[PDB]
Paper text:
Src homology 3 (SH3)-domain growth factor receptor-bound 2-like (endophilin) interacting protein 1 (SGIP1) and its splicing variant, SGIP1α, are brain-specific homologs of FCHo1/FCHo2. The μHDs of SGIP1 and SGIP1α, which are identical to each other, are highly homologous to those of FCHo1/FCHo2. The μHD of SGIP1/SGIP1α also binds to the DPF motif-rich region of Eps1519. Thus, the SGIP1/FCHo1/FCHo2 μHD is a domain designed for recognizing the locally ordered structure formed by the two consecutive DPF motifs.
To gain further insights into the mechanism of DPF-motif recognition by the μHD, we solved the crystal structures of the SGIP1 μHD in two different space groups. The two structures are similar to each other, and the minor differences in the secondary structure composition are probably due to crystal packing effects. The structure of the SGIP1 μHD adopts a topology similar to those of the previously determined μHD structures. However, the SGIP1 μHD possesses unique structural features that distinguish it from the other known μHD structures. Among these distinctive features, the most prominent one is the presence of the SGIP1/FCHo1/FCHo2-specific insertion of a relatively long α-helix (α2) between β6 and β7. Due to this insertion, the loop between α2 and β7 and the N-terminal part of β7 also adopt conformations strikingly different from those in other μHDs. Since these regions contain critical Eps15 interacting residues (see below), these unique structural features of the SGIP1 μHD are functionally relevant.
Residue numbers in the entry: 557 to 633, 639 to 828
Write the structure that this text describes.
Amino acid sequence: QDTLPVAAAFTETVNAYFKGADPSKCIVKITGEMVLSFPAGITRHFANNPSPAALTFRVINFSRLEHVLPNPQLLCCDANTKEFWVNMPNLMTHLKKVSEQKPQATYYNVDMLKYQVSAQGIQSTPLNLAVNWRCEPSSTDLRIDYKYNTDAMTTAVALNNVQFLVPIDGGVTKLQAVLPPAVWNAEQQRILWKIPDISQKSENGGVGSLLARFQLSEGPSKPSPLVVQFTSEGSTLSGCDIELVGAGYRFSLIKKRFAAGKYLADN
Ligand SMILES: [Zn+2]
Ligand SMILES: [Zn+2]
Ligand SMILES: [Zn+2]
Ligand SMILES: [Zn+2]
């Protein structure tokens, strides 16, 4: 059983732009990459195997992907499934090069597939947002409504390190009625909320509001984009998975994760 243990990862990035409370105006773009990881020692392995067993895999739910770019050195020579035969001499050349360059490395990550995920508006979005501003001549009311949305992801999984940053115009003298607690950057004139986790297991099922009032010393505030951050582990957005075909290899791990890229909301 000289089967090389190997690892795979899908990593997805969701971009979203929300416009007031109007779902039809939400612009969504999801991208991703599939990466193969080879464990230190592969070089010795290929030293014993000049003509190794072919590395062939199949990507599940392939129809959910569009704009697929296969590694032009390692790949490319029907509905929902696509099979690949990795180019072995080029993979070994590669792995020899990076190994003789980072000999201390515990694994070598190789990019196989770059792709886009067919998205359908606000449904494809793991965190729904609606922002409302009330801009008085000397006062500003800010409301951020968020909703954890399981429909965007393959399996119900938490959002981690969630950040809500928003610039406040008009020269703020004082913060009032701030709920939950946030952090005011004075030098930068902008407010930041942090929630460590959001999910079904969160309070109110992952549905919440961020509230702030601001006293101004200069005119009204002009609303600015809410910028959001979060990461996630244990699920993809695309619903893709990977399988080995043929003998000689084993997946030691298949890591699935996604993260917010440009994730904005306007008034
Ligand atoms: Zn071996
Ligand atoms: Zn096929
Ligand atoms: Zn290379
Ligand atoms: Zn990469």
